[PDB]
Design a protein around this ligand. Structure first.
Ligand SMILES: [Mg+2]
Ligand SMILES: [Mg+2]
Ligand SMILES: [Mg+2]
Ligand SMILES: [Mg+2]
Ligand SMILES: [Mg+2]
Ligand SMILES: [Mg+2]
Ligand SMILES: [Mg+2]
Ligand SMILES: [Mg+2]
Ligand SMILES: [Mg+2]
Ligand SMILES: [Mg+2]
Ligand SMILES: [Mg+2]
Ligand SMILES: [Mg+2]
Ligand SMILES: [Mg+2]
Ligand SMILES: [Mg+2]
Ligand SMILES: [Zn+2]
Ligand SMILES: [Zn+2]
Lengths: 80, 52, 97, 91, 136, 103, 212, 25
RNA sequence: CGCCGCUAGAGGUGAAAUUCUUGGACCGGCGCAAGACGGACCAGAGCGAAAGCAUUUGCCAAGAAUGUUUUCAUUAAUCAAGAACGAAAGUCGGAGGUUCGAAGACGAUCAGAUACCGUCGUAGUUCCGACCAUAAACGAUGCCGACCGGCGAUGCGGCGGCGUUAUUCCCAUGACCCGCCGGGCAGCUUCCGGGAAACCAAAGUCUUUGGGUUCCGGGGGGAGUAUGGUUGCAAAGCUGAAAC
């Protein structure tokens, strides 16, 4: 017997994107503080295109299968 | 034929230098150039029969 | 019936594997189905090592080995005393010591 | 309608000259009477002249080609080999 | 003859090609290059019968006679190349090689290094046997 | 290379419906003499005389030159009209960036 | 007749820089009429491994020598080829490694053009349970470019004395093993074979320059 | 007798009977 | 095949013989030519709808899985007729012909061999074009979908882990180690349940019998035969019965 009504959060983090009960995704939105000028740029986690900041003309994200890697020393936060 | 490398596929050549075309003249044929000697300027060719 | 689950060989994903000749009777056999071994031998008789160790020019530093991927088919390997038969629960075994 | 089922262009011969001979003459009579697309002007007005000579109605540009088709596959092989041995180390 | 060099302690080298087959055995003594065959005795030369020319007794008599002739022509040491029929055939050497190394090292003929230059193909042009090959 | 030709085909798809262009040698000569044309595109197998003349008019009139590597049948495929064509003239690029890609 | 009463004895002098230059001694017939004695000497070769030439390098990695000419009963040889012994080559092919090949034609500074090869293997890194250790094949296509690239700079701008002096410690192999580390841990890097296809010229002046 | 060679003999008999039919159409 | 040295045997077998051999074979050494083939690395590994695919390199399009807070919004599954691929062998043209080798030839073994063994050698084996559409085409298990135990693996993505290690010095991807997720090829165990059993995580969720759907079998022989029709150049393929 297993409580499917109230499962363990350790299980809920481990299980797949869509196996669990509420089926929320695993991606997030991250705010990148640009090294060049000042600008905070809202960017998606699993971005597919290159992300150019409109002022500084420096490449933020090299898009990769999975989640993109950043350029150099750019923090991020979790917001919902 | 001294200019061309071996493996060159030609047609309408001279046997002796200066008789304006004798070998491999018929329709749809070719001679093939192989094995140059630098000194004593000679060259092997394959004729369309199989004569080297 | 099935005598074996794997049908003898080890092809499962494939549709066709190359054949390789046997050494004895020269029959082509798919190269997982064949009985495969590998003879590492001293190229001298191990009893005859000492005769060459007597009159060897160098200081016994040359020690040549002969390596052969040896490759049998099952129809002659059993006759040539390699793959001797077993029991029902003894077919489930792996590598001999 | 479809007036013949098998013989195609070779029906002009009739019941004579033999089955396999008509079978082997079909596949190259279609080739020598087919219009081809000119590689120069881009139109489809190639037509065979006397044997070995091909001609396009636009631009009058006359190309020495195969005896029955526009290019022999052996000749295309020779042209590819000639350009390869050309740019191979510059003679 | 006087042959090579004197001043003992120095060895005069020769290459011995040993060719061990399942129905014959060759021992062959050549110079370091390979053209000049010094002495060449097979197994069937030493044994009269036809079936014994792959037996290990044939390699002993071939080895004794070649070791005699090499001492006659004054060459001391031997590098040893060993081989069998390796194209499509049995890559293993015959039984004669075990005999021929022993009966060279036993009576003079000091040995340098030994290699097994058996001609191994890349990818095996068709076998002599057929589809199902040898039967009995 | 392949990204360049795919860029050429996609930007020609956009110029096909958005921008303004003229076709044909005689009509492009009007636009190149009037300077209205910005960028000319010549097919591979156009004759060498006409190719040299259009390239000479462009080097006179300060106009972008491009050689479309391809037979004039598939140049018509590129411009999206069933007849064949040898010379494109982008006299008004509406949304594209073909001229802002190479020169 | 007993023709070994007739056959003449020459000594075989090795070329430079090995450590010592006495290979051995050979035997032809005798300069008699049309048959000059120096003819077969121009054609003979020599197959000899190390530890007697290079004075205690590796025992394997044979060398092939082509006898250039003879000089006052001394027959001198130039470099011809370099091979590995069958026992060493058939060793170090383990069932669960990944054998990697490479081959390249390359011209020297002078008129020599030569073909040389390369063999490589993967390596079980220490502290490992996964007993396979294969490569994803794109690192293999990377490393064939790498091993073809480095040989072009050790051979293409060098001459023969320097490339043989590179082949003495396998400096090509130690260099590829060093430059390999960022891509994969290769193991037992060798060149395994180098053989000539065209010799430029006889050049006894270059032979005397090889000596001193 | 194998089913293989039984099919072969029936096949050869079929070819013989076809030749007999074509000999008397 | 060309030369170079030596020298009477060399092949080949259960044992020998046919065959090559002082006109120098086999053997070694160098070199050239031709065609076929890609060993070892190669595994209960991958990929492909299957048949299949293994030297390097480039070009050409194509695809699975994974990641996705991307788009469209029921476009879905199985399918009579119809259609594309479909190993080996076989057939028709063109090119060449290394090895093997049906047929055929001999030599031996046997009472007899036309069989196995050996020597020679035809078509084919190769490539380019067309056809034929069959196999123990096998996991002898139609396809899609869901549920029902565990365990260690391994291949491919993705994610987490101041563990270790190579750069030069952060930095990343590199190489192992630890663990999770997705689906793939598999395996050990078990009283999951089944079946006639062998055995199977499917061949289970079936007398408590119903998720959807195509093809099929009805004692053995006669027989995939006859006979019609249809395809094929032909070999034959597809459909296919009865008397007894
Ligand atoms: Mg049984
Ligand atoms: Mg199969
Ligand atoms: Mg018997
Ligand atoms: Mg020979
Ligand atoms: Mg086929
Ligand atoms: Mg026939
Ligand atoms: Mg005919
Ligand atoms: Mg004909
Ligand atoms: Mg034969
Ligand atoms: Mg069937
Ligand atoms: Mg089905
Ligand atoms: Mg089916
Ligand atoms: Mg991984
Ligand atoms: Mg990567
Ligand atoms: Zn066998
Ligand atoms: Zn035209």
């Amino acid at each position: 017997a297993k409580d499917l009504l109230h499962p363990s959060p350790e299980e809920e983090k481990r299980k797949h994107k869509k196996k669990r009960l509420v089926q929320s995704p695993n991606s997030y939105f991250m705010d990148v503080k640009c090294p060049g000028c000042y600008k905070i740029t809202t960017v998606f986690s699993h971005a597919q295109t290159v992300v150019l900041c409109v002022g500084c003309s420096t490449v933020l994200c090299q898009p990769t299968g999975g989640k993109a890697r950043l350029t150099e020393g750019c923090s991020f936060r979790r917001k919902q | 034929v001294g200019t061309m490398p071996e493996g060159t596929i030609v047609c309408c050549l001279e046997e002796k230098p200066g008789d304006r075309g004798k070998l491999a003249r018929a329709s749809g044929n070719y001679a093939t150039v192989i094995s140059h000697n630098p000194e004593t300027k000679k060259t092997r060719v394959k004729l369309p029969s199989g004569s080297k | 019936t099935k005598k074996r689950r794997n049908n003898g060989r080890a092809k499962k994903g494939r549709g066709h594997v190359q054949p390789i000749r046997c050494t004895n009777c020269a029959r082509c056999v798919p190269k997982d189905k064949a009985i495969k071994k590998f003879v590492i031998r001293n190229i001298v008789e191990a009893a005859a090592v000492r005769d060459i160790s007597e009159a060897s020019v160098f200081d016994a530093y040359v020690l040549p080995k002969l390596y052969v991927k040896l490759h049998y088919c099952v129809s002659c390997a059993i006759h040539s005393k390699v793959v001797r038969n077993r029991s029902r629960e003894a077919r489930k075994d792996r590598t001999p010591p | 309608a479809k007036r013949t089922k098998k013989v195609g262009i070779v029906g002009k011969y009739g019941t004579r000259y033999g089955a396999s001979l008509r079978k082997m003459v079909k596949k190259i009579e279609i080739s020598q009477h087919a219009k081809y697309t000119c590689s120069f002007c881009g139109k489809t007005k190639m037509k065979r002249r006397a044997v070995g000579i091909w001609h396009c109605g636009s631009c009058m540009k006359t190309v020495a080609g195969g005896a029955w088709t526009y290019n022999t596959t052996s000749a295309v092989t020779v042209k590819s080999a000639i350009r390869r041995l050309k740019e191979l180390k510059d003679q | 003859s006087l042959g090579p060099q004197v001043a003992e302690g120095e060895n005069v080298f020769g290459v011995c090609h040993i060719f061990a087959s399942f129905n014959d055995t060759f021992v062959h003594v050549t110079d370091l290059s390979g053209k000049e065959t010094i002495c060449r005795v097979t197994g069937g030369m030493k044994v009269k019968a036809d079936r014994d020319e792959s037996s290990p007794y044939a390699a002993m008599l071939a080895a004794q006679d070649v070791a005699q002739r090499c001492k006659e022509l004054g060459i001391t040491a031997l590098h040893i190349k060993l081989r069998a029929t390796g194209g499509n055939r049995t890559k293993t050497p015959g039984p004669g090689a075990q005999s021929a190394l022993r009966a060279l090292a036993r009576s003079g003929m000091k040995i340098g290094r030994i290699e097994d230059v058996t001609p191994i193909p890349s990818d095996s042009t068709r076998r002599k046997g057929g589809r199902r090959g040898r039967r009995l | 290379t392949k990204k360049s030709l795919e860029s050429i085909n996609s930007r020609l798809q956009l110029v096909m419906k958005s921008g303004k262009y003229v076709l044909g040698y005689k009509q492009t000569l009007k636009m190149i003499r009037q300077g209205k044309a910005k960028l000319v595109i010549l097919a591979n197998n156009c004759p060498a005389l006409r190719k040299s003349e259009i390239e000479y008019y462009a080097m006179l009139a300060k106009t972008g030159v491009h050689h479309y590597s391809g037979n004039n049948i598939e140049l018509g495929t590129a411009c999206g009209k069933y007849y064949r064509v040898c010379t494109l003239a982008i006299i008004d690029p509406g949304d594209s960036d073909i001229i802002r890609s190479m020169p | 007749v007993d023709p070994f009463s007739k056959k003449d004895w020459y000594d075989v002098k090795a070329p430079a820089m090995f450590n010592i230059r006495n290979i051995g001694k050979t035997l032809v017939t005798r300069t008699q009429g049309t048959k000059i004695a120096s003819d077969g000497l121009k054609g003979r070769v020599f197959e000899v491994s190390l530890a007697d030439l290079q004075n205690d390098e590796v025992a394997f990695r044979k060398f092939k020598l082509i006898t250039e000419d003879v000089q006052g009963k001394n027959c001198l040889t130039n470099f011809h080829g370099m091979d590995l012994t069958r026992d060493k080559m058939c060793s170090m092919v383990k069932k669960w490694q990944t054998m990697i090949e490479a081959h390249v034609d390359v011209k020297t500074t002078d008129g020599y053009l030569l073909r040389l090869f390369c063999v490589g293997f993967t390596k079980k890194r220490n502290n490992q349970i996964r007993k396979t250790s294969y490569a994803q094949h794109q690192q293999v296509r990377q490393i064939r470019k790498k091993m073809m690239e480095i040989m072009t700079r050790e051979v293409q701008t060098n001459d023969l004395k320097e490339v043989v002096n590179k082949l003495i410690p396998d400096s090509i192999g130690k260099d590829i093993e060093k430059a390999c580390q960022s891509i994969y841990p290769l193991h037992d890097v060798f060149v395994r074979k180098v053989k000539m296809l065209k010799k430029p010229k006889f050049e006894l002046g270059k032979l005397m320059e090889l000596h001193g | 007798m194998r089913a293989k060679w039984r099919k072969k003999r029936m096949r050869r008999l079929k070819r013989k009977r076809r030749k007999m039919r074509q000999r008397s159409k």
